[PDB]
Design a protein around this ligand. Structure first.
Ligand SMILES: *Cc1c(COP(=O)(O)O)cnc(C)c1O
Ligand SMILES: *Cc1c(COP(=O)(O)O)cnc(C)c1O
Lengths: 322, 322
């Protein structure tokens, strides 16, 4: 009943050839909550958790591909940095979190996986707790089959983006978008605007009217061989990071920068990236084509290379011990 | 073990004189989740609920005092209005929600209770669902003992406030603060700034530098007998609404308006209000006293009247059927 492979129609993206074990009750998906490994149907958290009642929680998502977790080190580092930005003291060490998460994946038997690790301020206290020692933070994880924000044919042919105008990306003076978080009020409004206006993906602007990010993904713009991505109102993504390293390795200048609306529209190429789906082209904005409306050459070589980095031996990869 | 009453030291606030049934496992605390009435230790929601993973959820909190719910219809009306603002279609009617919530309180036996009702977009889908009919929203409730945002002595003596400078209330163009929500990034940052600077409660400003609201409460400013409260960056509180009704009853003009920092500091009186604690004075701001730094006559009149409205038979009350 669980779907854990596809035929992708892409040479450079291939799932692993294997069968889940029917006698394993965590096969195909599972969670780690409060010290126990559980099936998805049991993956529940206290309604009193502040991560629910005040979204007082940060998180990351890493993926596993062909049995190796991608940049797990970077992910857990960011997670802990983000927790610290919120004054949340993780109850586990980074190495303990890595060990538990890898074992969680191991128990699902999943070779291609989406793994969420969230850390909340816990359910033993309220925001009005004067005594910070009373807080009891929780780590909650789950691992499920790799999820694609964008379909395979759209990785190959491109997506039609829209610049949201009913909403702007929450400012850092209210909620820091460089700390990964569950407070998606603005991102969901943008998705809803996408539905209303008949487009496929929202790109948001910041309060200064400059390019920010999308709904769960960063945006990258290419112009005369120079590869740029918003530095400010944008999560420092690990896919983005990888994309800029790829660009540099291909001979292109690659930088975080402020990008105007005009520059977005005038781009030779535009692309999107996030852990849940990888990298894909954006071939139009607001119904206007980007160049000739087909995925650009530099975009295609970044995509192919990103998927090669998922499979080549390197320090980017941590193998799961099934 | 459960604390459900207090000696308050205030003549106008008195808890009911009763004992819980020790043989009733829901006594003193319970939740309603997915059709089941449960004790607090079994009150859990799916971690895949978009109300956690994307804070895609609105709520309200109503209280029960001496066995009567206070302004229950305004609350559920507001909750359904807020849900509509988010395009969440409640899976129950307003009347069904009232019936369940009152039954929940009955089973707890609490005569003085805090009751949360939240509605999420549910766990059967993600924000990347093209087909919006596949969303299955969830209503989650809990009822626990009445919760006081400020201690009794500070209702009497007044609270020392602080205008936050490290943070602004989230703009309406990102997350609408007139829709009650769990996305407290900014509110919590304002509270943390309160710890850092050594004050008791935060008041935020909006992006225009005008008075917004507090972390879980509305602010009201009184000057030459005129009672004003921020109209824009502030939740339309049912407590606020009651305060202005009371204010009109006493002969004062009472309005929603834009309030400056300078007006805040020059006020004759300032107070705070919310469901979880009632009404209370703010006797200083950033260390500067408001007037003579003791609670003012109008505020004291409001507070006393609010507590009479919690007790006198009127259309504002709905009895719990114990
Ligand atoms: C997950 C996410 C990204 C991408 O981060 P990766 O580390 O590449 O997964 C970008 N923006 C937002 C808002 C996100 O939630
Ligand atoms: C709950 C709340 C209030 C007060 O609303 P009531 O209807 O009086 O409870 C004010 N501001 C915020 C941000 C809130 O969450």
């Amino acid at each position: 009943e669980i779907v854990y492979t596809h035929d992708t129609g892409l040479d450079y993206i291939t799932y692993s050839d294997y069968e889940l074990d029917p006698a394993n009750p965590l096969a195909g998906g599972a969670a780690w909550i409060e010290g126990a490994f559980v099936p998805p149907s049991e993956a529940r958290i206290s309604i009193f958790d502040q991560g629910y009642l005040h979204s007082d929680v940060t998180y990351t998502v890493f993926h596993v591909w062909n049995g190796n977790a991608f940049r797990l080190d970077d992910h857990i580092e960011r997670l802990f940095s983000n927790a610290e930005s919120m004054r949340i003291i993780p109850p586990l060490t980074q190495d303990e979190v890595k060990e538990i998460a890898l074992e969680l994946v191991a128990k699902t038997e999943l070779r291609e996986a989406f793994v969420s690790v969230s850390i909340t301020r816990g359910y033993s206290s309220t925001p009005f707790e004067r005594d910070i020692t009373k807080h009891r933070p929780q780590v909650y994880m789950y691992a499920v089959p790799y999820q694609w924000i964008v379909p395979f044919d759209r990785i190959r042919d491109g997506v039609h983006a829209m610049v949201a105008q009913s909403v702007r990306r929450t400012p850092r003076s209210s909620i820091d978008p460089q700390v990964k978080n569950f407070q998606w009020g603005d991102l969901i409004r943008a998705v809803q605007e996408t539905h209303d206006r008949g487009f496929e993906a929202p790109l948001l602007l910041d309060g200064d009217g400059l390019l920010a990010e999308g709904s769960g993904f960063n945006v990258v713009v290419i112009k005369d061989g120079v590869v740029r991505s918003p530095g400010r109102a944008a999560l420092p993504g690990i896919t983005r990071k990888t994309v800029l390293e790829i660009a540099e390795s291909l001979g292109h200048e690659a930088i975080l920068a402020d990008i105007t609306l005009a520059e977005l529209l005038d781009a030779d190429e535009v692309l999107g990236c996030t852990t849940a789906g990888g990298v894909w082209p954006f071939v139009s904005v607001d119904g206007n084509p980007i160049s000739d409306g087909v995925p650009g050459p530099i975009t295609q070589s970044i995509i192919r290379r990103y998927w090669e980095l998922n499979v080549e031996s390197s320090s980017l990869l941590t193998p799961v011990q099934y």
